[PDB]
Write an enzyme that holds these catalytic residues in place. Structure first.
Site, PDB file in Angstrom:
ATOM      1  N   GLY A   8       0.943  -1.010  -0.029  1.00 47.85           N
ATOM      2  CA  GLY A   8       0.081   0.237  -0.151  1.00 47.85           C
ATOM      3  C   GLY A   8       0.917   1.440  -0.182  1.00 47.85           C
ATOM      4  O   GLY A   8       0.152   2.028  -0.657  1.00 47.85           O
ATOM      5  N   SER A   9       2.006   1.117   0.501  1.00 51.01           N
ATOM      6  CA  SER A   9       2.924   2.429   1.138  1.00 51.01           C
ATOM      7  C   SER A   9       3.412   2.613  -0.318  1.00 51.01           C
ATOM      8  O   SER A   9       4.415   2.171  -1.473  1.00 51.01           O
ATOM      9  CB  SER A   9       4.131   1.827   1.519  1.00 51.01           C
ATOM     10  OG  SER A   9       5.186   2.674   1.404  1.00 51.01           O
TER      11      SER A   9
END
Lengths: 209, 209
Positions: free
Chosen positions: A8-9
């Site tokens: 997700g980063s």
């Protein structure tokens, strides 16, 4: 080499897109569970005392800061220099854009959204205005330009795709920044790691559920 | 080349120290009066649409972001690569440290002190703690090390001198970070631009008067 990351980063996704662009595969990809404080283990701190993600571990060399990793991968493993050319002025422009991405554009993302999605505070309108300021600058950078840091697609475009796609999945309306909208749709087409990036954006979107 | 700057500014001072280290002189040095919004003139915006300082103007090439300027000067005008070596891993470590300086260490400075000196708000203890966190990381980076980014003095040391000297002039007690204290006093001795930097710190100190 091993990459310590979370899908997700945004900074992680910038590294993953860079690796795909270069035809580089990680020998190992380790998802760090930050809820379990996995970044705080003696073993992790030994590699990265700052306990951040992404962290690259390449034959005993530890590296962190996504934008440092991106440049490292191009310079070490790149079949050519297209994404980060040998030319000093071209590199300088890319570098300025990378600092802008970290210090202004993505900063505006975290400062507006993190207090909401992580700290459960109401949206701060002044912080919203800071996003608009940042997009206005990016829009100006792209005036009359196909790409964000010179005449060819570069690492700046990858960093900005990671950041802007996070704004996109967060529901921020950037259509009104006409040059940004144009640049974004075109750059997606030229990014072999795009599908993986957008899938990772869905993991980030879970924070908004 | 022309440098648009303010002597009190830490990012400006990092550029000035770099130029001195390289034996590079600016053909022109222009102090920007930000109280008069000199950065907002059409002429300034034409060079730097983001209207920040420092801005370098080198034979038609405009560049901003202090750390991009530092690297540019070494790569273009450096008689050798000592401050920013050709070696990919050495450059990568310096780059990570430069991002740390911008995003963590100097960020902790501005987030704590700017609301006080510019906005006239009381000191925020949580922001003070963030400075301590940042110094703790720098202290760990310097554990067992003479310099901040490898075995030789580098651009990382110059960037950190600009930042840490600002903490120094602001009255922040960093003596307790033993490795930082050691590194700082030694690095000063090896910095030909140090006297100019400390003089510029006095201009910044005016904000605390």
């Amino acid at each position: 080499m091993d990459l310590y990351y979370r899908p997700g980063s945004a900074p992680c996704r910038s590294v993953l897109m860079t690796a795909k662009a270069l035809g580089v595969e990680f020998d190992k990809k380790t998802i760090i569970n930050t809820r379990a404080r996995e970044q705080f283990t003696p073993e992790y701190l030994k590699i990265n005392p700052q306990h951040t993600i992404p962290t690259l571990h390449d034959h005993g060399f530890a590296l962190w800061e996504s934008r440092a990793i991106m440049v490292y991968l191009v310079e070490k493993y790149g079949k050519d220099d297209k994404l980060f050319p040998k030319d000093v002025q071209k590199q300088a422009l890319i570098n300025q854009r990378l600092y802008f991405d970290m210090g202004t554009l993505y900063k505006s993302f975290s400062e507006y959204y993190y207090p909401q999605i992580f700290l459960k505070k109401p949206a701060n309108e002044e912080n919203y205005k800071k996003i608009e300021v940042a997009f206005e600058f990016l829009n100006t950078f792209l005036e009359g330009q196909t790409y964000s840091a010179g005449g060819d697609y570069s690492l700046a475009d990858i960093a900005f795709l990671a950041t802007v796609s996070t704004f996109d999945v967060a529901g921020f309306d950037f259509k009104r920044y006409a040059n940004v909208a144009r640049w974004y749709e075109n750059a997606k087409k030229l990014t072999p790691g795009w599908e993986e990036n957008w899938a990772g954006c869905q993991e980030f979107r879970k924070y908004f559920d």
